[PDB]
Swiss-Prot record:
Belongs to the peptidase A1 family. GO terms for molecular function: aspartic-type endopeptidase activity. Its EC number is 3.4.23.22. The keyword Ribosomal protein does not apply. The keyword Disulfide bond applies. The chain holds residues 90 to 419 of 419 of the full protein. This is Endothiapepsin. The active site is at residues 35, 199. Disulfide bonds join 255-290. It catalyses: Hydrolysis of proteins with specificity similar to that of pepsin A, prefers hydrophobic residues at P1 and P1', but does not cleave 14-Ala-|-Leu-15 in the B chain of insulin or Z-Glu-Tyr. Clots milk. It comes from Cryphonectria parasitica.
Length: 330
Protein backbone atom coordinates (compact mmCIF):
# COMPACT_ATOMS: atom_id res chain seq x y z
CA UNK A 1 0.00 0.00 0.00
CA UNK A 2 0.88 3.68 -0.23
CA UNK A 3 -0.49 7.02 0.91
CA UNK A 4 -0.02 10.58 -0.36
CA UNK A 5 -1.28 13.74 1.38
CA UNK A 6 -0.76 17.43 0.81
CA UNK A 7 0.70 19.43 3.67
CA UNK A 8 -0.10 23.16 3.89
CA UNK A 9 1.61 25.99 5.79
CA UNK A 10 -0.55 27.34 8.62
CA UNK A 11 0.42 30.96 7.97
CA UNK A 12 2.44 33.27 5.72
CA UNK A 13 5.69 32.46 7.55
CA UNK A 14 5.53 28.66 7.28
CA UNK A 15 5.47 28.45 11.08
CA UNK A 16 4.15 24.89 10.81
CA UNK A 17 2.42 22.64 8.28
CA UNK A 18 -0.92 20.83 8.60
CA UNK A 19 -2.00 17.65 6.87
CA UNK A 20 -5.56 16.31 6.81
CA UNK A 21 -6.05 13.01 8.64
CA UNK A 22 -9.20 10.87 8.68
CA UNK A 23 -10.02 9.38 12.11
CA UNK A 24 -12.87 7.05 12.93
CA UNK A 25 -16.02 5.80 11.25
CA UNK A 26 -17.58 7.78 9.68
CA UNK A 27 -14.39 9.73 9.10
CA UNK A 28 -13.67 12.80 11.19
CA UNK A 29 -11.05 14.86 9.36
CA UNK A 30 -8.60 16.75 11.56
CA UNK A 31 -5.63 18.83 10.42
CA UNK A 32 -2.56 17.49 12.18
CA UNK A 33 1.02 18.69 12.49
CA UNK A 34 3.20 15.81 11.26
CA UNK A 35 6.18 15.78 13.60
CA UNK A 36 9.27 13.66 12.92
CA UNK A 37 10.60 14.80 16.31
CA UNK A 38 7.94 13.09 18.44
CA UNK A 39 5.98 9.87 18.57
CA UNK A 40 2.45 10.55 19.83
CA UNK A 41 -0.64 10.97 17.66
CA UNK A 42 -2.80 13.25 19.80
CA UNK A 43 -5.87 15.30 19.02
CA UNK A 44 -8.15 17.96 20.36
CA UNK A 45 -11.30 16.11 21.35
CA UNK A 46 -14.71 16.19 22.96
CA UNK A 47 -12.77 15.47 26.19
CA UNK A 48 -10.57 18.58 25.95
CA UNK A 49 -11.22 21.13 28.71
CA UNK A 50 -13.66 23.51 27.05
CA UNK A 51 -11.80 26.71 27.92
CA UNK A 52 -8.72 25.27 26.19
CA UNK A 53 -10.46 24.81 22.84
CA UNK A 54 -10.51 27.90 20.59
CA UNK A 55 -11.47 27.12 17.00
CA UNK A 56 -9.87 23.68 16.57
CA UNK A 57 -11.73 20.78 15.04
CA UNK A 58 -12.26 18.06 17.64
CA UNK A 59 -12.35 14.28 17.52
CA UNK A 60 -15.46 12.86 19.22
CA UNK A 61 -14.83 9.16 19.87
CA UNK A 62 -18.45 8.51 20.89
CA UNK A 63 -19.46 9.31 17.29
CA UNK A 64 -17.02 6.77 15.84
CA UNK A 65 -18.29 3.21 15.56
CA UNK A 66 -14.72 1.89 15.42
CA UNK A 67 -13.40 3.81 18.47
CA UNK A 68 -12.51 1.78 21.55
CA UNK A 69 -11.22 3.15 24.85
CA UNK A 70 -7.77 1.76 25.56
CA UNK A 71 -8.53 0.92 29.15
CA UNK A 72 -6.23 2.44 31.76
CA UNK A 73 -3.98 4.19 29.25
CA UNK A 74 -2.92 7.79 29.72
CA UNK A 75 -0.41 10.05 28.02
CA UNK A 76 1.44 13.26 28.79
CA UNK A 77 3.99 15.05 26.63
CA UNK A 78 6.17 18.13 26.84
CA UNK A 79 7.78 19.59 23.74
CA UNK A 80 11.06 21.43 23.27
CA UNK A 81 9.27 24.76 22.96
CA UNK A 82 7.74 24.37 26.41
CA UNK A 83 4.26 23.39 25.25
CA UNK A 84 2.45 20.31 26.56
CA UNK A 85 -0.69 18.20 26.47
CA UNK A 86 -2.12 15.11 28.17
CA UNK A 87 -5.14 12.83 28.25
CA UNK A 88 -6.44 9.31 27.67
CA UNK A 89 -6.32 6.96 24.69
CA UNK A 90 -8.60 5.35 22.14
CA UNK A 91 -7.80 2.99 19.33
CA UNK A 92 -9.49 3.80 16.01
CA UNK A 93 -9.06 3.69 12.26
CA UNK A 94 -6.73 6.38 10.94
CA UNK A 95 -6.11 7.17 7.28
CA UNK A 96 -3.59 9.53 5.69
CA UNK A 97 -3.76 10.22 2.00
CA UNK A 98 -5.50 6.91 1.28
CA UNK A 99 -3.32 4.77 3.58
CA UNK A 100 -5.34 3.18 6.39
CA UNK A 101 -4.23 1.81 9.76
CA UNK A 102 -6.73 0.01 11.95
CA UNK A 103 -6.21 -0.05 15.71
CA UNK A 104 -4.09 3.11 15.78
CA UNK A 105 -3.65 4.71 19.20
CA UNK A 106 -5.39 8.08 19.08
CA UNK A 107 -4.44 10.07 22.14
CA UNK A 108 -7.35 12.25 23.20
CA UNK A 109 -6.35 15.50 24.94
CA UNK A 110 -8.00 16.36 28.22
CA UNK A 111 -5.58 19.27 28.70
CA UNK A 112 -3.46 21.33 26.32
CA UNK A 113 -1.12 24.24 27.04
CA UNK A 114 -1.86 27.78 25.98
CA UNK A 115 0.31 27.62 22.84
CA UNK A 116 -1.97 24.91 21.44
CA UNK A 117 -5.21 26.63 22.41
CA UNK A 118 -4.02 29.84 20.78
CA UNK A 119 -3.32 28.15 17.45
CA UNK A 120 -6.70 27.48 15.89
CA UNK A 121 -5.18 25.88 12.79
CA UNK A 122 -3.59 22.81 14.44
CA UNK A 123 -5.99 20.10 15.62
CA UNK A 124 -3.25 17.85 17.03
CA UNK A 125 0.06 16.19 16.22
CA UNK A 126 0.97 13.02 14.34
CA UNK A 127 4.35 11.80 15.55
CA UNK A 128 6.76 10.20 13.13
CA UNK A 129 9.87 9.70 15.29
CA UNK A 130 10.63 6.24 16.70
CA UNK A 131 7.99 4.53 18.83
CA UNK A 132 10.40 4.29 21.76
CA UNK A 133 9.50 7.97 22.48
CA UNK A 134 5.74 7.36 22.65
CA UNK A 135 4.41 8.56 26.02
CA UNK A 136 1.42 6.25 26.52
CA UNK A 137 1.47 4.50 29.89
CA UNK A 138 1.43 1.76 31.05
CA UNK A 139 1.61 0.23 27.57
CA UNK A 140 3.63 2.24 25.05
CA UNK A 141 1.97 2.59 21.65
CA UNK A 142 3.25 2.59 18.07
CA UNK A 143 3.30 5.48 15.65
CA UNK A 144 1.15 5.57 12.54
CA UNK A 145 4.24 4.83 10.43
CA UNK A 146 5.31 1.92 12.63
CA UNK A 147 1.81 0.41 12.36
CA UNK A 148 1.65 0.95 8.58
CA UNK A 149 5.19 -0.16 7.78
CA UNK A 150 4.69 -3.85 7.10
CA UNK A 151 1.87 -3.10 4.64
CA UNK A 152 3.72 -0.39 2.72
CA UNK A 153 5.25 -1.14 -0.66
CA UNK A 154 8.56 0.10 0.81
CA UNK A 155 9.12 0.94 4.51
CA UNK A 156 9.62 4.67 3.95
CA UNK A 157 7.93 8.01 4.14
CA UNK A 158 9.03 11.25 2.50
CA UNK A 159 8.69 14.90 3.43
CA UNK A 160 8.53 17.48 0.66
CA UNK A 161 7.72 20.73 2.45
CA UNK A 162 7.04 23.89 0.44
CA UNK A 163 8.40 27.38 0.89
CA UNK A 164 5.32 29.58 1.25
CA UNK A 165 3.42 26.85 -0.62
CA UNK A 166 1.87 23.41 -0.06
CA UNK A 167 3.97 20.26 -0.20
CA UNK A 168 3.55 16.54 0.24
CA UNK A 169 3.97 13.66 2.67
CA UNK A 170 4.16 10.28 0.93
CA UNK A 171 4.10 6.87 2.59
CA UNK A 172 5.45 3.70 1.03
CA UNK A 173 7.10 5.05 -2.12
CA UNK A 174 9.63 7.54 -3.42
CA UNK A 175 8.25 9.93 -6.05
CA UNK A 176 11.16 10.16 -8.46
CA UNK A 177 9.58 13.19 -10.15
CA UNK A 178 9.67 15.24 -6.93
CA UNK A 179 13.40 16.00 -6.76
CA UNK A 180 16.37 16.83 -8.97
CA UNK A 181 19.61 14.88 -9.21
CA UNK A 182 20.13 11.98 -6.83
CA UNK A 183 19.16 11.25 -3.24
CA UNK A 184 22.13 11.04 -0.89
CA UNK A 185 21.58 8.68 2.00
CA UNK A 186 23.23 9.08 5.38
CA UNK A 187 23.35 7.03 8.59
CA UNK A 188 20.83 7.44 11.41
CA UNK A 189 21.19 6.83 15.11
CA UNK A 190 17.97 5.85 16.87
CA UNK A 191 19.58 5.94 20.33
CA UNK A 192 17.61 9.02 21.42
CA UNK A 193 14.45 8.03 19.51
CA UNK A 194 14.97 10.64 16.79
CA UNK A 195 15.95 10.67 13.12
CA UNK A 196 19.43 11.71 14.23
CA UNK A 197 22.20 12.09 11.67
CA UNK A 198 25.49 13.91 11.11
CA UNK A 199 25.84 16.70 8.58
CA UNK A 200 29.27 16.99 6.99
CA UNK A 201 29.49 20.79 7.25
CA UNK A 202 28.23 24.12 6.01
CA UNK A 203 28.77 27.21 3.91
CA UNK A 204 27.44 30.75 4.25
CA UNK A 205 26.38 32.40 1.00
CA UNK A 206 29.03 31.99 -1.68
CA UNK A 207 31.67 31.28 0.96
CA UNK A 208 33.91 28.25 1.18
CA UNK A 209 32.49 25.03 2.60
CA UNK A 210 33.60 24.21 6.14
CA UNK A 211 33.96 20.47 6.68
CA UNK A 212 32.82 19.71 10.20
CA UNK A 213 30.53 17.10 11.75
CA UNK A 214 27.21 18.45 13.00
CA UNK A 215 25.03 15.89 14.77
CA UNK A 216 21.36 16.81 14.72
CA UNK A 217 17.79 15.66 14.18
CA UNK A 218 15.53 15.90 11.14
CA UNK A 219 12.45 17.45 12.75
CA UNK A 220 9.44 18.50 10.70
CA UNK A 221 7.72 19.72 13.87
CA UNK A 222 10.30 22.44 14.55
CA UNK A 223 10.05 25.64 12.50
CA UNK A 224 13.64 26.86 12.51
CA UNK A 225 17.19 25.59 11.98
CA UNK A 226 19.06 25.32 15.31
CA UNK A 227 22.83 24.88 15.01
CA UNK A 228 25.95 25.36 17.15
CA UNK A 229 26.67 28.93 18.23
CA UNK A 230 29.88 29.05 16.18
CA UNK A 231 28.00 28.20 12.95
CA UNK A 232 25.15 30.59 13.68
CA UNK A 233 27.53 33.45 14.50
CA UNK A 234 29.37 32.87 11.21
CA UNK A 235 26.06 33.09 9.32
CA UNK A 236 24.73 36.27 10.94
CA UNK A 237 28.12 38.01 10.70
CA UNK A 238 27.40 38.20 6.96
CA UNK A 239 24.23 40.27 7.55
CA UNK A 240 24.88 43.96 8.29
CA UNK A 241 23.17 44.97 11.50
CA UNK A 242 22.25 41.47 12.63
CA UNK A 243 22.66 40.75 16.34
CA UNK A 244 21.60 38.33 19.02
CA UNK A 245 18.90 39.86 21.18
CA UNK A 246 18.38 38.35 24.61
CA UNK A 247 15.12 40.31 24.95
CA UNK A 248 13.68 38.97 21.70
CA UNK A 249 15.14 35.48 22.17
CA UNK A 250 17.59 35.08 19.32
CA UNK A 251 19.17 36.63 16.29
CA UNK A 252 17.36 39.51 14.67
CA UNK A 253 18.28 41.46 11.58
CA UNK A 254 17.19 44.63 9.76
CA UNK A 255 14.16 43.90 7.65
CA UNK A 256 15.88 45.88 4.84
CA UNK A 257 18.63 43.23 4.59
CA UNK A 258 19.14 40.72 1.81
CA UNK A 259 19.95 37.41 3.51
CA UNK A 260 22.65 35.07 2.23
CA UNK A 261 21.93 31.42 1.57
CA UNK A 262 23.06 28.68 3.91
CA UNK A 263 24.39 25.34 2.67
CA UNK A 264 24.53 22.14 4.70
CA UNK A 265 26.36 18.94 3.82
CA UNK A 266 24.85 15.49 3.44
CA UNK A 267 27.79 13.23 2.81
CA UNK A 268 29.49 14.70 -0.26
CA UNK A 269 26.22 16.34 -1.35
CA UNK A 270 25.06 19.87 -0.55
CA UNK A 271 21.61 21.29 0.22
CA UNK A 272 21.24 25.04 -0.32
CA UNK A 273 18.74 26.97 1.77
CA UNK A 274 17.94 30.23 -0.06
CA UNK A 275 18.28 33.39 1.99
CA UNK A 276 14.58 34.16 1.79
CA UNK A 277 13.82 30.91 3.68
CA UNK A 278 15.69 32.37 6.66
CA UNK A 279 13.42 35.44 6.98
CA UNK A 280 10.72 35.07 9.67
CA UNK A 281 9.52 38.64 9.39
CA UNK A 282 9.00 41.46 11.86
CA UNK A 283 9.45 40.58 15.52
CA UNK A 284 6.17 42.42 16.20
CA UNK A 285 3.69 44.00 13.83
CA UNK A 286 5.17 47.06 12.15
CA UNK A 287 8.71 46.52 13.44
CA UNK A 288 11.70 46.92 11.15
CA UNK A 289 13.57 44.26 13.15
CA UNK A 290 13.08 40.80 11.64
CA UNK A 291 13.50 37.40 13.28
CA UNK A 292 16.10 35.01 11.93
CA UNK A 293 15.43 31.48 10.76
CA UNK A 294 18.83 30.14 11.86
CA UNK A 295 19.28 30.22 15.63
CA UNK A 296 21.68 28.80 18.20
CA UNK A 297 21.04 25.36 19.65
CA UNK A 298 23.16 26.19 22.70
CA UNK A 299 21.12 25.17 25.71
CA UNK A 300 18.64 23.10 23.67
CA UNK A 301 21.13 20.28 24.00
CA UNK A 302 20.69 19.11 20.42
CA UNK A 303 20.98 20.54 16.91
CA UNK A 304 17.70 20.60 15.01
CA UNK A 305 17.26 20.52 11.24
CA UNK A 306 13.78 21.96 11.33
CA UNK A 307 11.50 23.16 8.55
CA UNK A 308 13.88 25.93 7.40
CA UNK A 309 16.37 23.23 6.39
CA UNK A 310 14.01 20.42 5.41
CA UNK A 311 11.88 22.53 3.08
CA UNK A 312 14.98 23.09 0.92
CA UNK A 313 15.11 19.33 0.25
CA UNK A 314 13.19 16.23 -0.65
CA UNK A 315 13.70 14.10 2.45
CA UNK A 316 13.44 10.33 2.72
CA UNK A 317 12.80 8.78 6.12
CA UNK A 318 13.86 5.19 5.49
CA UNK A 319 12.44 2.89 8.15
CA UNK A 320 14.19 -0.26 7.00
CA UNK A 321 15.67 -2.57 9.64
CA UNK A 322 18.63 -0.20 9.78
CA UNK A 323 17.05 3.23 9.29
CA UNK A 324 18.67 5.91 7.13
CA UNK A 325 17.85 9.42 5.91
CA UNK A 326 17.99 10.61 2.34
CA UNK A 327 18.25 14.17 1.02
CA UNK A 328 17.88 15.47 -2.52
CA UNK A 329 17.71 18.96 -3.95
CA UNK A 330 14.45 19.90 -5.64
Amino acid sequence: STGSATTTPIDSLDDAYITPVQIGTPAQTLNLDFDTGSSDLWVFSSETTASEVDGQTIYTPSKSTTAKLLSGATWSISYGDGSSSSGDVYTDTVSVGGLTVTGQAVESAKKVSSSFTEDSTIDGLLGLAFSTLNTVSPTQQKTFFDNAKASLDSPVFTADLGYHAPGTYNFGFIDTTAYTGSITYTAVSTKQGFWEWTSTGYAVGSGTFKSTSIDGIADTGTTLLYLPATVVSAYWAQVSGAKSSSSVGGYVFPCSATLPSFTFGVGSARIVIPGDYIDFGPISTGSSSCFGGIQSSAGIGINIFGDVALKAAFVVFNGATTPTLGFASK
